[PDB]
Amino acid sequence: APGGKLKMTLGLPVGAIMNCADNSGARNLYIIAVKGAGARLNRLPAGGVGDMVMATVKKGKPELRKKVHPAVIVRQAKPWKRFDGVFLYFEDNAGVIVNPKGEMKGSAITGPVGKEAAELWPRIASNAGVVM
Amino acid sequence: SHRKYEAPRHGSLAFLPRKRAARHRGRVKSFPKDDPKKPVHLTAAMGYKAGMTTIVRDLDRPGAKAHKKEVVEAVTIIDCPPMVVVGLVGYIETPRGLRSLTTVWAEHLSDEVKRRFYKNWYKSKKKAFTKYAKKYAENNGASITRELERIKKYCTVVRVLAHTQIRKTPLKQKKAHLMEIQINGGSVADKVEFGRSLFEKPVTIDTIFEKDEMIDVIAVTKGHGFVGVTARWGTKKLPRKTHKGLRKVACIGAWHPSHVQWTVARAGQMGYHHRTSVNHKIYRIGKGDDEANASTETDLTKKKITPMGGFVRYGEVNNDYVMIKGSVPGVKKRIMTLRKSLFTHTSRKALEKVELKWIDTSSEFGHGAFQTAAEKKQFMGTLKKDL
RNA sequence: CACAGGGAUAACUGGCUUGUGGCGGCCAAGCGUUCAUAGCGACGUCGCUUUUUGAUCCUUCGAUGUCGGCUCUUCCUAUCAUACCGAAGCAGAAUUCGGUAAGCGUUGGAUUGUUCACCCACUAAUAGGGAACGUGAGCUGGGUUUAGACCGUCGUGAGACAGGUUAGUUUUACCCUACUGAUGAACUCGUCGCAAUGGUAAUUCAGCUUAGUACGAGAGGAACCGCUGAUUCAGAUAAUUGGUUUUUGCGGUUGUCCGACCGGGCAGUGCCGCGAAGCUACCAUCUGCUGGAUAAUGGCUGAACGCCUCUAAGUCAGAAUCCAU
RNA sequence: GCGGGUAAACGGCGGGAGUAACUAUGACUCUCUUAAGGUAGCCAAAUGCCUCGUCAUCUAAUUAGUGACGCGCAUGAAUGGAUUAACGAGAUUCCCACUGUCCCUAUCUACUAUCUAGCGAAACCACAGCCAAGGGAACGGGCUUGGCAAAAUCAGCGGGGAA
RNA sequence: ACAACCAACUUAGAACUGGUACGGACAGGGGGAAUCUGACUGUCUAAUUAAAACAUAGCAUU
RNA sequence: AACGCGGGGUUAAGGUGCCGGAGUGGACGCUCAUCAGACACCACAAAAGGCGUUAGUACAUCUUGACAGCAGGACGGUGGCCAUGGAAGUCGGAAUCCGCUAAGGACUGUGUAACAACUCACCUGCCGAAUGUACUAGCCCUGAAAAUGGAUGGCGCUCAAGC
RNA sequence: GUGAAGCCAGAGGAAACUCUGGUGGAGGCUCGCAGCGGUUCUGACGUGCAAAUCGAUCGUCAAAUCUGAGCAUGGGGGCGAA
Ligand SMILES: [Mg+2]
Ligand SMILES: [Mg+2]
Ligand SMILES: [Mg+2]
Ligand SMILES: [Mg+2]
Ligand SMILES: [Mg+2]
Ligand SMILES: [Mg+2]
Ligand SMILES: [Mg+2]
Ligand SMILES: [Mg+2]
Ligand SMILES: [Mg+2]
Ligand SMILES: [Mg+2]
Ligand SMILES: [Mg+2]
Ligand SMILES: [Mg+2]
Ligand SMILES: [Mg+2]
Ligand SMILES: [Mg+2]
Ligand SMILES: [Mg+2]
Ligand SMILES: [Mg+2]
Ligand SMILES: [Mg+2]
Ligand SMILES: [Mg+2]
Ligand SMILES: [Mg+2]
Ligand SMILES: [Mg+2]
Ligand SMILES: [Mg+2]
Ligand SMILES: [Mg+2]
Ligand SMILES: [Mg+2]
Numbered sequence A: 001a002p003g004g005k006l007k008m009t010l011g012l013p014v015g016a017i018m019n020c021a022d023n024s025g026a027r028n029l030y031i032i033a034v035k036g037a038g039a040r041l042n043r044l045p046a047g048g049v050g051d052m053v054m055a056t057v058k059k060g061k062p063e064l065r066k067k068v069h070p071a072v073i074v075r076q077a078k079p080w081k082r083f084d085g086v087f088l089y090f091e092d093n094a095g096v097i098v099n100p101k102g103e104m105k106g107s108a109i110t111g112p113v114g115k116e117a118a119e120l121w122p123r124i125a126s127n128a129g130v131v132m
Numbered sequence B: 001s002h003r004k005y006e007a008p009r010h011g012s013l014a015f016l017p018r019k020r021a022a023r024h025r026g027r028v029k030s031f032p033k034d035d036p037k038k039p040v041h042l043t044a045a046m047g048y049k050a051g052m053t054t055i056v057r058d059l060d061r062p063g064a065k066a067h068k069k070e071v072v073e074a075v076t077i078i079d080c081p082p083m084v085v086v087g088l089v090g091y092i093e094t095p096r097g098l099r100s101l102t103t104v105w106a107e108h109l110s111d112e113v114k115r116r117f118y119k120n121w122y123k124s125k126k127k128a129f130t131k132y133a134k135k136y137a138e139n140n141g142a143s144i145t146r147e148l149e150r151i152k153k154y155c156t157v158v159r160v161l162a163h164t165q166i167r168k169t170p171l172k173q174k175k176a177h178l179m180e181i182q183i184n185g186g187s188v189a190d191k192v193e194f195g196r197s198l199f200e201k202p203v204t205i206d207t208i209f210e211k212d213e214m215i216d217v218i219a220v221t222k223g224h225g226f227v228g229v230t231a232r233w234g235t236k237k238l239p240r241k242t243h244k245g246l247r248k249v250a251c252i253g254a255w256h257p258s259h260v261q262w263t264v265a266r267a268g269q270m271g272y273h274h275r276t277s278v279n280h281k282i283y284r285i286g287k288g289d290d291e292a293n294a295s296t297e298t299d300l301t302k303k304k305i306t307p308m309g310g311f312v313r314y315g316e317v318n319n320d321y322v323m324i325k326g327s328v329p330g331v332k333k334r335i336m337t338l339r340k341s342l343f344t345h346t347s348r349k350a351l352e353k354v355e356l357k358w359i360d361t362s363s364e365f366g367h368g369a370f371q372t373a374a375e376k377k378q379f380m381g382t383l384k385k386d387l
Numbered sequence C: 001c002a003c004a005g006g007g008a009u010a011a012c013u014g015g016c017u018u019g020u021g022g023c024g025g026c027c028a029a030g031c032g033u034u035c036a037u038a039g040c041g042a043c044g045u046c047g048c049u050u051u052u053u054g055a056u057c058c059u060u061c062g063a064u065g066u067c068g069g070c071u072c073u074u075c076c077u078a079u080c081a082u083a084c085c086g087a088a089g090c091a092g093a094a095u096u097c098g099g100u101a102a103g104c105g106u107u108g109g110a111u112u113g114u115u116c117a118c119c120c121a122c123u124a125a126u127a128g129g130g131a132a133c134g135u136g137a138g139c140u141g142g143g144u145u146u147a148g149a150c151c152g153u154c155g156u157g158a159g160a161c162a163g164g165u166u167a168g169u170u171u172u173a174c175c176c177u178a179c180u181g182a183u184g185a186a187c188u189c190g191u192c193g194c195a196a197u198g199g200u201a202a203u204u205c206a207g208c209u210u211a212g213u214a215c216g217a218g219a220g221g222a223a224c225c226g227c228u229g230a231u232u233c234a235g236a237u238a239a240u241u242g243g244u245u246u247u248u249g250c251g252g253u254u255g256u257c258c259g260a261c262c263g264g265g266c267a268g269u270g271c272c273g274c275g276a277a278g279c280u281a282c283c284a285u286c287u288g289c290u291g292g293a294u295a296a297u298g299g300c301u302g303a304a305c306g307c308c309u310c311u312a313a314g315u316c317a318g319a320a321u322c323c324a325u
Numbered sequence D: 001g002c003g004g005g006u007a008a009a010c011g012g013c014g015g016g017a018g019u020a021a022c023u024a025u026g027a028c029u030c031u032c033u034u035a036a037g038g039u040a041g042c043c044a045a046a047u048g049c050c051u052c053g054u055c056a057u058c059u060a061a062u063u064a065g066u067g068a069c070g071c072g073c074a075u076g077a078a079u080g081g082a083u084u085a086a087c088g089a090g091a092u093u094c095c096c097a098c099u100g101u102c103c104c105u106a107u108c109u110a111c112u113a114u115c116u117a118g119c120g121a122a123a124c125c126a127c128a129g130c131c132a133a134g135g136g137a138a139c140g141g142g143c144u145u146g147g148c149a150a151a152a153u154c155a156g157c158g159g160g161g162a163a
Numbered sequence E: 001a002c003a004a005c006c007a008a009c010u011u012a013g014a015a016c017u018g019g020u021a022c023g024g025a026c027a028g029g030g031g032g033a034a035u036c037u038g039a040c041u042g043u044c045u046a047a048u049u050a051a052a053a054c055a056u057a058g059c060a061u062u
Numbered sequence F: 001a002a003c004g005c006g007g008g009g010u011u012a013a014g015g016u017g018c019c020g021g022a023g024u025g026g027a028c029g030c031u032c033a034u035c036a037g038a039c040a041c042c043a044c045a046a047a048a049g050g051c052g053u054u055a056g057u058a059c060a061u062c063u064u065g066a067c068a069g070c071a072g073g074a075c076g077g078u079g080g081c082c083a084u085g086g087a088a089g090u091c092g093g094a095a096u097c098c099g100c101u102a103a104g105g106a107c108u109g110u111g112u113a114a115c116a117a118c119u120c121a122c123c124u125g126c127c128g129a130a131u132g133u134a135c136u137a138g139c140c141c142u143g144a145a146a147a148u149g150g151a152u153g154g155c156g157c158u159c160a161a162g163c
Numbered sequence G: 001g002u003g004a005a006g007c008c009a010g011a012g013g014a015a016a017c018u019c020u021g022g023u024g025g026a027g028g029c030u031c032g033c034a035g036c037g038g039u040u041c042u043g044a045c046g047u048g049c050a051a052a053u054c055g056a057u058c059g060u061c062a063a064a065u066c067u068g069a070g071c072a073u074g075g076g077g078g079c080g081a082a
């Protein structure tokens, strides 16, 4: 789970389907859990841009489907603000498949990537294009 | 049988008598511990909540993510015209607690503070302190000197009776607020001399507090009326198909105790509670006579703290004001009680020196996009009304 | 299906009992390379508990609403995690056992009415229970389930089944008390205070540094202090962002009516865009203290008992504990 | 009574033991009994208890669903079997769309509730109404022992009155 | 074969134009892959059951 | 202990610190519990264990002097017999006799390519009246964990107001 | 809305019967208003407006459709798409 991450508005609860921003062969990612989630009755675990989640591939390559993968949310449509006071949001929700260590399965990232993911995951920062 | 899934209780029992506050003015229930080695000083002050605004500053916090970068922070503004010290109260120790042995008043009291002693000031004879005023003339103030000497001899706690100059605020109220402010430091004789020298004299809030100081704000919170459990205690809403109401608590107690217990959430009064919020940093103490009290070293535009069009539902801050990081209990126009901190501060967040860079002065009445009227005129150009 | 009754008599709570269920102790053959007692542990034996099920029939049959789930509060400890300690077949790391300990937490889902269970996943941990098998004038009605209906087996039949399936009305509070809030007579009316008593609050994790250092042949690999964040909880607040729109504020627009235009009515807010103010969201922001006394343990001095010994007199330190602030 | 017919009359439709160049099973056989011993089909089906049967598929996870399998407690041929386009306010599973069902609640409108003028019931009621423990008909409002305990009241409320 | 006179509506094509909007209110089907079951339309427990129950045509028997 | 309505006296069971009428009555002991105990029926407790009090058995010292707290000695055949480059008491095993000393074994362990120095049993010597072992049973303690807050009846009680 | 027989015309072919525009206006067909009914909210109400109503949502809607008056069947009897 990323360390040093500041509090931000979480846009994607468990059950959300987001786009796959890398070229691993998956079309989307279906979030089943979040790594940092605590315990609270009835509260769905939720994640924001730049934290690790557990996801399954609903549409994509057959040898990527039917499994559980670690993923990192690279952009979200729910507006949130950083310490600079600017509220920002992306067009869609998207994430990338990674190892438990944080290394991407794919080799390229399509579209922009939120700054939090790039700061917290060096592999995503190296593979990313436009950041924020 | 046991509760199936564990969950913490809703709300706190530490604020349990969720009743209306007994008094509108906030109550200082504890003053900072006295230290005779320190110089004599007042420990509290009063002001009026004007509103909130936004500031930008460079954060000085090594190791933090936002270190040496701009941060946007919400701040609160308290209009603080100088208070007037009008009295002294001496307190002695007793096996039953502290008790006031005596109090001494100034020779002249203003109508602002005299209004506090009346319910029907308009139709009264306004005789509040007329007989007391004669004591300064009879026997060359022998009784006044006697009471001051009694306070010096016996009392261990000295407080000044001070009132607000509410007429300098845009408030429609004319009745001033009066309270006791403890004098800390020095001996009891020093405290008495300080309080007596301050008689019918104004004290400004920059002589009491200073920038980057952590203070406490005491006030009565915003009042809501009779409120159900869902908002009053934050309980879970019952399903949509619930008969006879879903905005409730389903079980309000088991069988065997055979009483509704004090720990069960129930509908009732919400808000208008006395609160002592602590650890608020003073970002700026601006002066009323300063025509650019909202200006900055990096923002040289001559502007005052008041937003464009005035503070919504307050007016203009024409007096000295304090800027407090974050929010404080109470609505606008409320009488705020500022108290010195009871804690010892060692964290770098508490000890940081704050240097502002920009203070928002755009309109509070909408999506204000300009900081000054001159900026508005420059951007828009000439209008039809300018002829 | 009916009636007269029965708590003389069953099904559900409670009561006695505790075989059974659960949880401990004593002994210690044996296991544990070596060694009964680090940790297990046979034969035997002493118990505790009433979250199992039996046994009984004391209360209720002129009726105490019968499962489960949801919601919510509190209590218990036989402690899953968190605090501080002691022991190891404890080099480090990770574990295991035990002590003081119930302050604080103990989750999101697939299948199933479930209880129970088992999987997926997160987590510090996903501990076990009570409160009329807590909680139906709180809900719901999925289960049990009257009357309709189908099947299988049984019956000559009407019909039966602790078998499967489908459909099947969930009433009343305005009384008393309890609780949540709100007034208030009497002691002149006010202002400023005190504080008996009652309540009480915080919680856990992560990253950086320590440090690839202590310890290790090596694989590997702590910690104290300090710094920065985050989870759960609590109390506020609305500068900003988002939601809400009868501001029916401005604009657009359908039908119809006022002869057309202008300006309007009606369609219970005609509809649409924007929309200040107010309310409000971990959907937003701010804030959450330290003193004393201790428990287990670690000690000092020091007898009993010429020696020893933290204890007997005395005394130091010390836990998420207790009492205060 | 006797003797024939009749199942689109009511209805019924069986056990045991060996057996194929390793083996498993048993085509085949040996044997006991019936009126006849379940044929064509179909199935953990609204019919199977064991059972959340076994395999495959659907999911991250499926006591659900579907497709297969069948010594089927207890399927089966007008007590109708199997299939079936179209139809169904019938029961069930999944997918897309959709959304406050939910995360997690917030806000707005009307009418109530609310306060007032007027009018104005009913249910129910041994007496009544604060608890803790004890004993007691083994769950007290009254009894015993303690805690305690201050007029008169309003809006809510659903713990108790085994209402 | 053209001109004149008379008469409603229905359809089609083009240009321009604005808020990229136009069945602008009102009015007004969600759809698909399957399983069980009854063929279908129809009928019944008025006041808890609308169903797979009843009926039906067809088939068969007496 | 059985009952008509009354007065006086005396008792029973039970009580006399206060509630509560009557004793902070008298005598001799026991018990300190960071879960004291105090309830005939009766309203909770056991096997097992612990240096407080008493008791039964046996033992040591009896001045020739106990346990605890101390210095010193283990002579001399003795390379004994088997074993060996080499282990003379201290690799391997069966066995340790004494002429001069209150006491010293072919030796209790240490050391060691063989040794030696060192150590123990024991005692002449410092001292100085009570000592060790195993048991028995009184009180107390551990064993002794449940759910609203709580009950030797309550308060409280410790040279008892407990036994 | 769909568009059954019957009918007109034109295309093929060899025949016979194929095809294509139209016409037509059948069906216990279909969407849907009134009527009739009463599925779900297990909504309102539940000392009600009401001893069965109210709202939304639903089934059917050209025929086993809905309905008036007159008449018949009368209690172990009637009547019953049960
Ligand atoms: Mg909330
Ligand atoms: Mg309901
Ligand atoms: Mg504003
Ligand atoms: Mg009985
Ligand atoms: Mg038992
Ligand atoms: Mg053991
Ligand atoms: Mg039992
Ligand atoms: Mg019974
Ligand atoms: Mg009964
Ligand atoms: Mg009864
Ligand atoms: Mg009841
Ligand atoms: Mg559930
Ligand atoms: Mg314990
Ligand atoms: Mg532990
Ligand atoms: Mg607690
Ligand atoms: Mg979790
Ligand atoms: Mg029970
Ligand atoms: Mg129950
Ligand atoms: Mg109830
Ligand atoms: Mg009910
Ligand atoms: Mg229930
Ligand atoms: Mg049901
Ligand atoms: Mg039935």
Ligand SMILES: [Mg+2]
Pocket: none
């Ligand atoms: Mg059945």
Ligand SMILES: [Mg+2]
Pocket: none
């Ligand atoms: Mg059913």
Ligand SMILES: [Mg+2]
Pocket: C167
């Ligand atoms: Mg139904």
Ligand SMILES: [Mg+2]
Pocket: none
């Ligand atoms: Mg207190």
Ligand SMILES: [Mg+2]
Pocket: C216
């Ligand atoms: Mg080393």
Ligand SMILES: [Mg+2]
Pocket: none
């Ligand atoms: Mg709030």
Ligand SMILES: [Mg+2]
Pocket: none
């Ligand atoms: Mg807005």
Ligand SMILES: [Mg+2]
Pocket: none
């Ligand atoms: Mg707004």
Ligand SMILES: [Mg+2]
Pocket: C245
């Ligand atoms: Mg609107």
Ligand SMILES: [Mg+2]
Pocket: C250
């Ligand atoms: Mg307009």
Ligand SMILES: [Mg+2]
Pocket: none
């Ligand atoms: Mg118009």
Ligand SMILES: [Mg+2]
Pocket: C266
């Ligand atoms: Mg009109």
Ligand SMILES: [Mg+2]
Pocket: none
């Ligand atoms: Mg409308």
Ligand SMILES: [Mg+2]
Pocket: none
């Ligand atoms: Mg808007």
Ligand SMILES: [Mg+2]
Pocket: none
């Ligand atoms: Mg010592």
Ligand SMILES: [Mg+2]
Pocket: C311
């Ligand atoms: Mg001591």
